[PDB]
């Protein structure tokens, strides 16, 4: 198997130097020319440069011609993106790949082309105004008209968090049947919101131990609040 | 440099077969490198066809890309379609100095049957009020098909500022869920009357109201 | 050194005056001039005391 | 006092090359004599090689002629090994040694060679294919009918986790009194399987606390796992 | 290429002298160099004897040491033994062609009464199952001499593969605890009716056999 591995991206201040890299596994890395792609969330893909398997041609864009610089390491089998002067739009995962076809050609044009069949695990660059501020964490009871062999929706609710990403695993990954974690939510005051539940039988009520995981990593806070339904006591 | 254009959104029911109109307005595309990719909202994109009619491991058979010679555009043909395919299609390609991007689509697999929208509002709460930040919560759950439009109001007056329509997503039921929020400050809370989140659902408007007697 | 008979005058010089809140350490060789009151609560100050 | 420290082999792919090592204090290390031996699990003890006090001398066995060098630094006062293309035979618990002094003999006909009058502490070696995996740990409660005057049985058990060393210790190792670690075993797919269980009143069940203390460094893992009563309610 | 030949074990009363044998299938070690060394179970080995009536330090003076030439042997005396140093003897020297090892002999002296053997059956963990884990475990402890054999079987038909044993090591109360491990799979695991552990100590034998159903 041929795989590639990307980090690097997170928090970042805006105008500053950044350096990236993109790792491999699988395949003869010098015989190959390499990529740097990025994919924007809520938008689509942002083709950055490309280069030559032995880094005499390079490609690049207009939209950020000269601004970023790009490079590649033959005998340490990594590929580098020294990427600057960072803006509102950037914010985007960078995606590593591997070229399809080296240098094909119609028959009378002859150019190193693009084409990825095989992409990497992705690392994304936090450029933002709001900053890496921690949640608050509300649990999510279900309410009692879902009783006598129903089913109660039930788990926590994460409001107001920043950055991405967060997973959410029912029983620390010991339940996976009904998870199902709706994404994030960008508000107007530049957080973050989701919700995510298990579908169970109402028979459980009063028996199955609820305690939901949040893992909210690149801020790395965790909630363990004791999961029940809210008692009905005046 | 150049630019393709691509249909936003396109239903189809998964028995027949859809085409996209991968139409590069200037230049011309003909002898030259052809790229085609599929996004599964929420993750990163699978290639589709390069080169004409080339397909990767594991995608089913069904896809089938094309080139209109004549009108300098490019389409794809996928028959038998599935629920499983409701996706994002893009458009790229290289031109001999840089690569171009398409509008984006959504592909809608009309297999199901449409949900009626029905919705419910979360108010803010009173402790949090005492630092002069609330945010007005809206859930949508339960519509078909997923294209949806989501739009604010304030006293009928449109609302334009911290407007945030998120994306809609797949449900355990096979229907579609988002929500959408609005950060206002208390001033702006009390003042207007009242507000409103107008949501439409395929031409029919869903919409419920919140009310400050719940505020204090 | 000692500047009582440079730098006093009679009834009490008020022209030297030194910054008590911040929101943060000031970084090395950093001056900052800002007159902005201070805020210890949720409620804007909006420039009065 | 005469003690000889221990550190460095371990996970290794077949075909590489690793530098173990040796050191001991409380003696002259220029002068005496050491010796190499590696232990095939189940197996009986095998010879290696051995170095004069010079640096000058070099003996070899059969197995690694040529394929392993040995070198000394009297300077640094520390032996060096060398092994080169791993064979999967190579897994055993390595065992740095001595001599009784510099090579000496007797009756005219005699060689620069003697006993092993010390032994190391070991250095267990891993050539194999599977990769770092983290440990995994489950609360195994005791029965509940173990009450009114017994003895009951629990613990922690330690699972698909790979390499070695584990640690397995009740209050971080202050309760001493009953814990016995069972051996580490292989299971089919590669990955080990083991037991460790603490010898406690029945009474102390749900009165004291109860945390194992699981310690797996070269994953830089730790696991506090608590033991409370099984809820095997309706 | 050579090899010294002594038993697996030897059990003998406390107040007995015991000795070992060191001989070698050919060559000739007369006048020659020699040593002994001991390893109680799992941890380092250590030294006994080096060139025959020899002591080192920190042992007790129950040991002898000779060598003989009418059979090619040396032998080590042990007079008045104890049950603190049960464990395995090896054998070395300096032979024609290289430094050579010995296959090694259990020591076992009889300082407690006997006792039948005690077989415990534990089958996957519930939580396991889902996981497609299995790992059969037999408990053998309490049992003396620490001498034990354990044997896998499915359905009266005897298991060889995913075999292992742990040697028993001593306990607080001078006993031995040893565990036997089997490598199975769920899908092999839950299709044999029955099994057996079998503990064959000292002809002494007490089988133990359960369901795989009690898991669920």
């Known amino acids: 198997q041929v795989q590639l591995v990307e980090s690097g991206g997170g928090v970042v201040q805006p105008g500053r130097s950044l350096r990236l890299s993109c790792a491999a596994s699988?395949?003869?890395?010098?015989?190959?020319?390499m990529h740097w792609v990025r994919q924007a969330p809520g938008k689509g893909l942002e083709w950055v440069a490309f280069?030559?398997?032995?880094?005499?041609?390079?490609y690049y864009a207009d939209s950020v011609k000269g601004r970023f610089t790009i490079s590649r390491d033959n005998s340490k089998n990594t590929l580098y993106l020294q990427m600057n002067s960072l803006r509102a739009e950037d914010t985007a995962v960078y995606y590593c790949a591997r070229d399809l076809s080296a240098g094909h050609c119609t028959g009378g044009v002859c150019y190193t082309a693009g084409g990825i069949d095989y992409w990497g695990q992705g690392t994304l660059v936090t450029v933002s105004s709001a900053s890496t501020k921690g949640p608050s964490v509300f649990p999510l009871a279900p309410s009692s008209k879902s009783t006598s062999g129903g089913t109660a929706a039930l788990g926590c609710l994460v409001k107001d968090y920043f950055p991405e990403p967060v997973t959410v695993s029912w029983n620390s990954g010991a339940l996976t049947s009904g998870v199902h974690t709706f994404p994030a939510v960008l508000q107007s005051s530049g957080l973050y919101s989701l919700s995510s539940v298990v579908t169970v039988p109402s028979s459980s009520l009063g028996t199955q131990t609820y305690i939901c995981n949040v893992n909210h990593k690149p801020s790395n806070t965790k909630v363990d609040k004791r999961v029940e339904p809210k008692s009905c006591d005046k | 440099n150049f630019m393709l254009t691509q249909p936003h959104s396109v239903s189809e029911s998964p028995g027949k077969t859809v085409t996209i109109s991968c139409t590069r307005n200037?230049?011309?595309?003909?002898?030259?490198?052809v790229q085609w990719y599929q996004q599964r909202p929420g993750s990163a994109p699978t290639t589709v066809i390069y080169?004409?009619?080339?397909?990767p491991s594991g995608v089913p058979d069904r896809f089938s890309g094309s080139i209109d010679s004549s009108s300098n555009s490019a389409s794809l043909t996928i028959s038998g379609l599935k629920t499983e395919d409701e996706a994002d299609y893009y458009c790229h390609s290289y031109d001999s100095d840089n690569v171009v991007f398409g509008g984006g689509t959504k592909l809608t697999v009309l297999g199901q049957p449409k949900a009626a929208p029905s919705v419910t509002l979360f108010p803010p709460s009173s402790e949090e009020l005492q630092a002069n930040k609330a945010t007005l919560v809206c859930l949508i759950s339960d519509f078909y098909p997923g294209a949806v439009t989501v739009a604010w109001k304030a006293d009928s007056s449109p609302v334009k500022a911290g407007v945030e329509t998120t994306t809609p997503s797949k449900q355990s039921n096979n229907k579609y869920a988002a929500s959408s929020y609005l950060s206002l400050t208390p001033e702006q809370w009390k003042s207007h009357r009242s507000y409103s989140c107008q949501v439409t659902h395929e031409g029919s408007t869903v919409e419920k109201t919140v009310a400050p007697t719940e505020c204090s | 050194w000692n500047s009582n008979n440079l730098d006093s005058k009679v009834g009490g010089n008020y022209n030297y005056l030194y910054r008590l809140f911040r929101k943060s350490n000031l970084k090395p060789f950093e001056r900052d001039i800002s007159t902005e009151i201070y805020q210890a609560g949720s409620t804007p100050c909006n420039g009065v005391e | 006092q005469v003690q000889l420290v221990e550190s460095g082999g371990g996970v290794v792919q077949p075909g590489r090359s690793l530098r173990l090592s040796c050191?001991?204090?409380?003696?002259?290390?220029?002068?005496?004599?050491?010796?190499?031996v590696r232990q095939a699990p189940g197996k009986g003890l095998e010879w290696?090689?051995?170095?004069?006090?010079?640096?000058?001398?070099?003996?070899?066995?059969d197995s690694v002629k040529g394929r392993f060098t040995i070198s000394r630094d009297n300077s640094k006062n520390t032996l060096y090994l060398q092994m080169n293309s791993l064979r999967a035979e190579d897994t055993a618990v390595y065992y740095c040694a001595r001599d009784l002094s510099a090579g000496h003999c007797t009756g005219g006909v005699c060689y620069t060679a003697g006993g092993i009058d010390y032994w190391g502490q070991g250095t267990l070696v891993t050539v194999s294919s599977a990769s770092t995996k983290g440990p995994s740990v489950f609360p195994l409660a005791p029965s509940s009918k173990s009450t009114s005057g017994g003895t009951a049985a629990l613990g922690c058990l330690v699972k698909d986790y790979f390499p070695e060393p584990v640690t397995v210790s009740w209050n971080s190792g202050a309760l001493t009194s009953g814990v016995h670690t069972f051996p580490a075993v292989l299971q089919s797919s590669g990955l080990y399987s083991l037991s460790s269980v603490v010898t406690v009143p029945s009474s102390s069940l749900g009165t004291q606390t109860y945390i194992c203390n699981v310690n797996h460094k070269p994953s830089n893992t730790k696991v506090d796992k608590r033991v409370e009563p099984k809820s095997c309610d309706k | 290429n050579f090899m010294l030949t002594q038993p697996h074990s030897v059990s003998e009363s406390p107040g007995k002298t015991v000795t070992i044998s060191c001989?070698?299938?050919?060559?000739?070690?007369?006048?020659?160099?020699?040593?002994?060394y001991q390893q109680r179970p799992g941890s380092a080995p250590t030294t006994?004897?080096?060139?025959?009536?020899?002591?080192?330090?920190?042992v007790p003076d129950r040991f002898s040491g000779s060598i003989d030439s009418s059979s090619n042997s040396a032998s080590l005396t042990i007079s008045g033994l104890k049950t603190e140093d049960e464990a395995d003897y090896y054998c070395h020297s300096y032979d024609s062609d290289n430094v050579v090892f010995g296959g090694g002999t259990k020591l076992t002296v009889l300082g407690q009464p006997k006792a039948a053997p005690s077989v415990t059956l534990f089958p996957p963990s519930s939580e396991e199952l889902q996981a497609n884990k299995a790992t059969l475990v037999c408990l053998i402890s309490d049992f003396y001499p620490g001498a034990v054999t354990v044997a896998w079987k499915a359905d009266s038909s005897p298991v060889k593969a995913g075999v292992e044993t742990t040697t028993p090591s001593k306990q607080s109360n001078n006993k031995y605890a040893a565990s036997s491990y089997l490598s199975l799979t769920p899908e092999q695991w839950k299709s044999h009716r029955s099994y057996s552990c079998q503990v064959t100590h000292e002809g002494s034998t007490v089988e133990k056999t359960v369901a795989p159903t009690e898991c669920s």
């Open positions: 080169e004409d009619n080339q397909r």
């Open positions: 200037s230049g011309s595309i003909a002898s030259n490198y």
């Open positions: 699988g395949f003869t890395f010098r015989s190959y020319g």
């Open positions: 280069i030559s398997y032995d880094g005499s041609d390079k």
